[PDB]
Ligand binder design. Structure first.
Ligand SMILES: [Mg+2]
Ligand SMILES: [Mg+2]
Ligand SMILES: [Mg+2]
Ligand SMILES: [Mg+2]
Ligand SMILES: [Mg+2]
Ligand SMILES: [Mg+2]
Ligand SMILES: [Mg+2]
Ligand SMILES: [Mg+2]
Ligand SMILES: [Mg+2]
Ligand SMILES: [Mg+2]
Ligand SMILES: [Mg+2]
Ligand SMILES: [Mg+2]
Ligand SMILES: [Mg+2]
Ligand SMILES: [Mg+2]
Ligand SMILES: [Mg+2]
Ligand SMILES: [Mg+2]
Ligand SMILES: [Mg+2]
Ligand SMILES: [Mg+2]
Ligand SMILES: [Mg+2]
Ligand SMILES: [Mg+2]
Ligand SMILES: [Mg+2]
Ligand SMILES: [Mg+2]
Ligand SMILES: [Mg+2]
Ligand SMILES: [Mg+2]
Ligand SMILES: [Mg+2]
Ligand SMILES: [Mg+2]
Ligand SMILES: [Zn+2]
Lengths: 50, 52, 146, 81, 88
RNA sequence: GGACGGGGAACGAGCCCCCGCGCCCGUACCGAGAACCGACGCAGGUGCUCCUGGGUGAGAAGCCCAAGGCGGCUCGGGUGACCCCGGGCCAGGGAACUCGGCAAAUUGGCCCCGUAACUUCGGGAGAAGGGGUGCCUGCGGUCUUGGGGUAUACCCCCGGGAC
RNA sequence: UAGUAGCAGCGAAGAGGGGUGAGAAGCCCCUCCGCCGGAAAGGACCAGGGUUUCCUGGCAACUUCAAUAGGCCAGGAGUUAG
RNA sequence: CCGUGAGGGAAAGCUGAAAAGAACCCCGGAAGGGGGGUGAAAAGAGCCUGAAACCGGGCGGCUACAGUGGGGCAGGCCCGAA
RNA sequence: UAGGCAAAGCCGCCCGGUGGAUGGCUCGGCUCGGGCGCCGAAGAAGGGCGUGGCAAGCUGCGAUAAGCCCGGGGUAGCCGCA
């Protein structure tokens, strides 16, 4: 939406911050055990109920 | 019309939003309480024995 | 970057009218800012094709023919052109201002003005020439009206 | 109150051209508080403060210094440049 | 810079375009000229290059009405590529 | 905003010049035949919700072209059998087809003439039926809109516009 | 089953030359050809979506084919009000 | 993650003793292949063992005038080390 | 006549690819027995958001944010899962 409430906007900021895979050194640190994050999503596939 | 065409009308409305007390997507903005925790119509937390 | 997107906004024209010279293919990949597109527009490697306006020579020729009376026959008409309601407004205004001027100056008495004013409203007179002919023929005024 | 400075390409162009320093402050800091913090911390004069809340949830303030103080000088004095 | 080693005039016949679908006739005629020149000049079809004036002649009446025949000039360059241009 | 009353001070404006302050939240982008919903980069739905040049035209109709955009309703090439989906034409006959004129076909705009039974007197009615229709060369009219003539209408002259 | 069905239908579509590149019908540029033009298509914008926006680079996966393209992937940036 | 919501709700364990996690050379656009190494053993990060279904190759028997599977007897070809 | 001699195809074995059974393992569960037993206006439980140099999740923590101070144990390493 063009016009947002700040409470809804802040929750979108939290989702935006967490949407990222684990860094490449974490994969090396864990010997390829930690490769994926559950907070990873696509905007078109998984919809936040914000 | 009750199937796919009527599904296209669910793009702009809303019945519930996020509840401040429990954080779930269960706050009824018209009835003005939470369908999960009961915030706004009951100061005690809503929880029933028939639900696991 | 897309040079045509930048160049169209500099030139103030559509992106469909922005032309990049094929000689400047090497310099496209180096352009970073709008100042770099401004350098190329000054050099003439980016310009804008002049826009098309629909030519009106055929229309302007045809409009003279239509004024002379060509191309308006029965086989060229599909709907209503003459306004019947609008014609009545001009018919009353032409005849009323003529009659009112005559009475205002004094050449027509208010009594004889009334019968003609009501005859105008009653659709007795086809046009102004008919009204002038009636006024001249019946001698409703001392001096003939042109 | 201040969290850090913004030294991006846009922020650096602003400092040289419009005498503006870009900072990240607390999300609840107002324009009155940001102007007071900048003047107190750095001993300059603020003309106006333009503030926005970024899509990542932070507050960014474009502080325009008054016309006797250099925005780039304060950046280079702090050592954050 | 590339030098010419053989020049010929050819009258390519495009009557076959009237036997294919109307919506691909002008593009089909490009294939006819490439296969014609490849056959007569003994090169592959990808080695043939079409001049701009020839292309405009093929597309002059849009995709459905290419010309029935074209008078062309074929030139074989020193490196092996053949150039075809409309006779003008 | 104005009026009508009461109270108060010795100052003082709705006029002119000058000075100060204006916090908080939104602001990117799509807004849809790929950014929303429908499990999809879905021929549906939401939103064509509001706006848009020229020619023909009654017309915001259709057709062609601007401004502006697009070739991304995200496979390409060859062949030119049967068969299928969509489309065109068909001599003579003219519903003989078929449950059934289903489907297709016919008519079609505008102008003029003309128009029945019946009727709740309003209608029926575009009833029905007949004729005209292009292009070119000239001659006129009814207005309209400015300017110039003594000149507010009329009359004369000049330029533009419509029928 | 089977390297088979489908990737037609709903009134647009491509072609030539050059450049990039390991690799080009498909990416970039020019020329031609076409479609919309009171709009499945141009301008604005609500809800909803939430970074899809911009820049750089890339092609293991995604896109009914390809790809050096990309709403994809990686990195960085971006929304200023009396 | 699914549903507007009340609510509903998965899949998914194992290198080696020690990374000693594969130096170096040729090829490839790259994934990667060959040679060469480490290790008791590739156990090679898609990592203990690694079945069947399934698919590819090699071998044995048949194969275009003969209607298929199971059993008994007879024969051909092939294997028949423990 | 039969063999050299073969198409497509069929059966068996071996090797390979796919797959993740089997076996071994186990910081997990389950059951039973014993104990202990309330927290909150001195603002709780629960939730949101944030917090790490490179950090997305979990765990911890709360703008003093994988942490600050004091004392006891513990002496040589430590900077959670990782
Ligand atoms: Mg969706
Ligand atoms: Mg409701
Ligand atoms: Mg005509
Ligand atoms: Mg009337
Ligand atoms: Mg905007
Ligand atoms: Mg699609
Ligand atoms: Mg245009
Ligand atoms: Mg296409
Ligand atoms: Mg017939
Ligand atoms: Mg019959
Ligand atoms: Mg019959
Ligand atoms: Mg019918
Ligand atoms: Mg097919
Ligand atoms: Mg085909
Ligand atoms: Mg059309
Ligand atoms: Mg058109
Ligand atoms: Mg129209
Ligand atoms: Mg639009
Ligand atoms: Mg890009
Ligand atoms: Mg983009
Ligand atoms: Mg992404
Ligand atoms: Mg603001
Ligand atoms: Mg294994
Ligand atoms: Mg033996
Ligand atoms: Mg065989
Ligand atoms: Mg808590
Ligand atoms: Zn609640």
């Amino acid at each position: 939406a063009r016009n947002k409430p700040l409470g809804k906007k802040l929750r979108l900021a939290a989702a935006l911050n967490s949407n990222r895979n684990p860094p490449l050194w974490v994969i090396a640190k864990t010997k390829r055990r930690v490769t994926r994050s559950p907070a990873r999503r696509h905007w078109r596939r998984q919809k936040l109920k914000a | 019309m009750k199937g796919t065409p009527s599904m296209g009308k669910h793009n702009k409305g809303k019945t519930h939003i996020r509840c401040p007390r429990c954080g779930r997507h269960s706050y009824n903005v018209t009835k003005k309480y939470c369908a999960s925790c009961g915030w706004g119509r009951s100061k005690r937390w809503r929880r029933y024995n028939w639900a696991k | 970057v897309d040079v045509k997107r930048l160049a169209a906004e500099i030139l103030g024209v559509g992106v469909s009218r922005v032309k990049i010279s094929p000689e400047a293919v090497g310099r496209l990949e180096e352009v970073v800012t709008k100042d770099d597109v401004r350098a190329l527009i000054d050099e003439g490697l980016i310009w804008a094709e002049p826009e098309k306006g629909n030519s009106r020579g055929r229309w302007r020729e045809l409009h003279e023919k239509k004024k002379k009376g060509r191309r308006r026959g029965q086989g060229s008409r599909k709907g209503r052109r003459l306004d019947e309601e609008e014609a009545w407004v001009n018919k009353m205004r032409v005849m009323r201002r003529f009659l009112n001027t005559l009475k205002r100056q004094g050449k027509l008495d208010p009594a004889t003005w009334r019968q003609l004013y009501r005859m105008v409203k009653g659709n007795y007179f086809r046009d102004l020439r008919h009204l002038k002919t009636y006024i001249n023929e019946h001698k409703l005024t001392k001096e003939p009206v042109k | 109150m201040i969290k850090r400075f913004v030294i991006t390409e846009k922020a650096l162009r602003l400092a040289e051209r419009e005498n503006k320093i870009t900072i990240i402050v607390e999300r609840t800091a107002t324009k009155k508080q940001i102007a007071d913090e900048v003047q107190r911390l750095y001993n300059v004069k603020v003309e106006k403060v333009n503030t926005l809340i970024t899509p990542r949830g932070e507050k960014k303030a474009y502080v325009k210094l008054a016309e006797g103080y250099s925005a780039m000088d304060l950046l280079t004095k702090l050592g954050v440049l | 810079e590339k030098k010419v080693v053989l020049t010929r005039e050819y009258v390519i016949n495009l009557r076959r375009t009237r036997e294919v679908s109307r919506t691909k006739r002008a593009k089909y005629a490009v294939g006819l000229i490439r296969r014609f020149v490849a056959r007569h000049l003994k090169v592959e079809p990808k080695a043939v290059k079409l001049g701009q004036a020839l292309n405009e002649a093929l597309w002059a009446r849009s995709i459905e009405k290419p010309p029935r025949r074209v008078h062309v000039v074929v030139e074989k360059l020193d490196d092996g590529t053949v150039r075809v241009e409309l006779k003008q």
